[PDB]
Structure 1
Amino acid sequence: GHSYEKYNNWETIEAWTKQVTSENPDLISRTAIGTTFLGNNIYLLKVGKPGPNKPAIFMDCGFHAREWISHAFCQWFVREAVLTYGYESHMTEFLNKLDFYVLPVLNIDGYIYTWTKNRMWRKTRSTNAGTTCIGTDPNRNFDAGWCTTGASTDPCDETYCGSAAESEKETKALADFIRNNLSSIKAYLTIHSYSQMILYPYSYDYKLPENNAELNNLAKAAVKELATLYGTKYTYGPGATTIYPAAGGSDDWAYDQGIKYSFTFELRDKGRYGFILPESQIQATCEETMLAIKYVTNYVLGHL
């Protein structure tokens, strides 16, 4: 069965996407935006009160297989939305005015692999010509200074950038969806762990986004809000200098598509447990993260 305070396997998450949609048809619609290399369905939940030409915020989880708290957060977010709509003024306003496009798990094949074989797997699970080595790093696989830095051209490496940008079915599917909905998508949020950071562009170069001052102010406010709940300390800044240079990331790509608010979130913790964050921290992690995501949403709505 599904639990919001446990890590759920794909079969359970999949069944959950069907159930939560079935139970909340006036707030959620479910679509598939493609298949993974191994034929799993890439679900996308449109969360919001339906209406004509609404703006949207896009959020994905589960880019990286081992970052289990990421997957947990997208599920937590959806429950919070449906439970508090009509009762909490901000979320009610949010869902009335815009849609959240929530992609609960992008790298499903890798996620399944962390459940069945290797808890520390990162990449996709696609085959590579000429080698037995498996998988591409999905966050090195986007058309953003592709493979020029912080990436490997070797399929045996953890940051393999792929044979070409969007060579992976999963990243192609995500990019296709965002490109098809650029007129509506006002912010892109991609959830990772760990490090307790909010990053904005750029990572593929040391150059700064034109609205750099705005993004720094937004991230600064978001981390302050997050800390109010349990005192959790986040840092923030442009990817390249705040964590490390790395090309081919979806946050940079999305920004260069014209989505002016693009953030990579790195959730708890700081390395005590690392990727193996205890289930006992799921609820607190998700609760404080909700505050930061809602703050960003409120800001974006006031700047349409």
Structure 2
Amino acid sequence: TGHSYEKYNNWETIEAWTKQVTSENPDLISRTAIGTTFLGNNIYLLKVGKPGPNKPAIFMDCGFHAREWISHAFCQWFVREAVLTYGYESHMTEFLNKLDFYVLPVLNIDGYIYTWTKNRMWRKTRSTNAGTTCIGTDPNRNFDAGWCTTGASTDPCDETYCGSAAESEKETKALADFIRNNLSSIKAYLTIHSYSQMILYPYSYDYKLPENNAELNNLAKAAVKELATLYGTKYTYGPGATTIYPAAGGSDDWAYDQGIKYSFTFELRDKGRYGFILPESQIQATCEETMLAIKYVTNYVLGHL
């Protein structure tokens, strides 16, 4: 149960960490719970930044999908960076002074626990479905964004089950509720996944392009260029539908249609050699190169308020 930033931490460890990282950095981090999972675990959200009046924000979550462990790991890496370098690195000091970073460590907690206890390749939530023994809904097929129209299944037994309705899951409802209650401050939405090495932007539920697809393409292009500067990691980018595959009900598409103009989905390492079982030995390298990308986007948004 001892936390490590170069190891994958189980939920009890991550929860302890949310509490300890908050208590040690009261001037930079505040922790709240935005809801509970189907199984009663607390959905924590850390608010990172120097508190001030009416601050704009960037919202980032990890752990939508249970088996994408490098995702969870990144949210934690991000937080330590914020606090070790505030006051020393000009950009991060500038980011933290100017905006508030909403970091949601793990969205799908019940599923994360399941990958640690029974099935390592579990992806969905762990809720029950009526009329079947099959368990779970794909949280990224559960948002109101052309809900269940494409790239989603209506069968609970499938890995891409879209749910009984949009926001049927307490976790997606909770996340959606928080974003809706904070539209005014939230300027960018970032949702961390794995794997494939890509940076996607709207839309995935459709082949139609967002109004600012030109900017998002340039932004994404610059961010991947940035990421590649550390270890040469090659990422592709573009609108989801055409870049990865069409898939309805994703949070990135939903957030974008809420008014949040900078909405990106990051698909971290690797390209399929280890897939979801990305070794711990790649945690720092992955997190380090990903920081550059997130920071690039952060500077851009700040400079485009």
Establish whether residue 301 from structure 1 lines up as the match of residue 302 from structure 2. Answer: yes
What's the CA shift for 1:186? Answer: 0.1
In 1: Cα distance, 2:286 partner to 2:78 partner? 12
Provide Cα deviations, 1:213-256, integer angstroms capped at 9, x if missing partner.
Answer: 00000000000000000110000000000010000000000000
RMSD: 0.2
**What is the CA distance between 1:177 and its match in structure 2?**
0.1
SS of equivalent residue, structure 1 residue 283: helix
Structure 2 Cα separation of the partners of residues 290 and 232 of structure 1:
13
Q: CA deviation at 1:81?
A: 0.1
2:231 alignment partner in structure 1: 230
Q: How much does 1:121 deviate?
A: 0.1
User: d(CA) in 1 for partners of 2:209 and 2:89?
Assistant: 37
TM-score by length of 2: 1.00
TM-score (norm 1): 1.00
C-alpha distance in 1 between matches for 2:126 and 2:213: 35
Q: Helix, strand or coil for the counterpart of 2:221?
A: helix
- For residues 90-109 of structure 1, the aligned pairs below 5 Å read 90-109=91-110
Deviation at 1:151, TM superposition (A): 0.2
CA distance in 1 between counterparts of 2:98 and 2:16 reads 28
State the alpha-carbon separation in 1 of the partners of residues 221 and 159 from structure 2.
Answer: 31
Q: Deviations over 1:77-134 (max 9, x none)?
A: 0000000000000000000000000000000000000000000000000000000000
Q: Distance in 1 between matches of 2:136 and 2:241?
A: 24
Structure 2 residues without counterparts, runs of 5 or longer: none
| Residue deviations 1:122-163 (CA, integer Å, cap 9, x gap) | 000000000000000000000000000000000000000000
Aligned equivalents of 1:165, 1:213: Cα separation in 2:
29
Paired residue for 1:137? 138
Shift of 1:21: 0.2
Shift, 1:184, TM fit: 0.2
> In structure 2, the residue corresponding to 1:102 is in which secondary structure?
strand
> Deviation above 3 Å: which 4+ runs of structure 1?
none
1:29-73: CA deviations, max 9, x gaps? 000000000000000000000111100000000000000000000
Measured in 2, the distance between the counterparts of 1:95 and 1:158 equals 38
Mapped to 2, the partners of 1:92 and 1:230 lie a distance apart of 25
Q: How far has the Cα of 1:284 moved from its partner?
A: 0.3
Residue 6 of structure 1: CA displacement? 0.1
SS at match of 1:303: coil
Residue 31 of structure 1 aligns to a residue in which SS?
Answer: strand
CA–CA distance in structure 1, aligned partners of residues 206 and 294 of structure 2:
26
Q: Which residue of 1 aligns with 2:180?
A: 179
Q: Distance in 1 between matches of 2:88 and 2:185?
A: 26
Q: Percent identity?
A: 100
Distance 1:231 1:206 in 2: 30
Query: May I ask how many residue pairs the two structures share in their alignment?
Result: 304
Q: 1:279 deviation in Å?
A: 0.1
After superposition, residues 7-26 of structure 1 pair within 5 angstroms as 7-26=8-27
Secondary structure of 1:177's aligned partner? helix
* Distance in 1 (alpha carbons) for counterparts of 2:243 and 2:168: 28
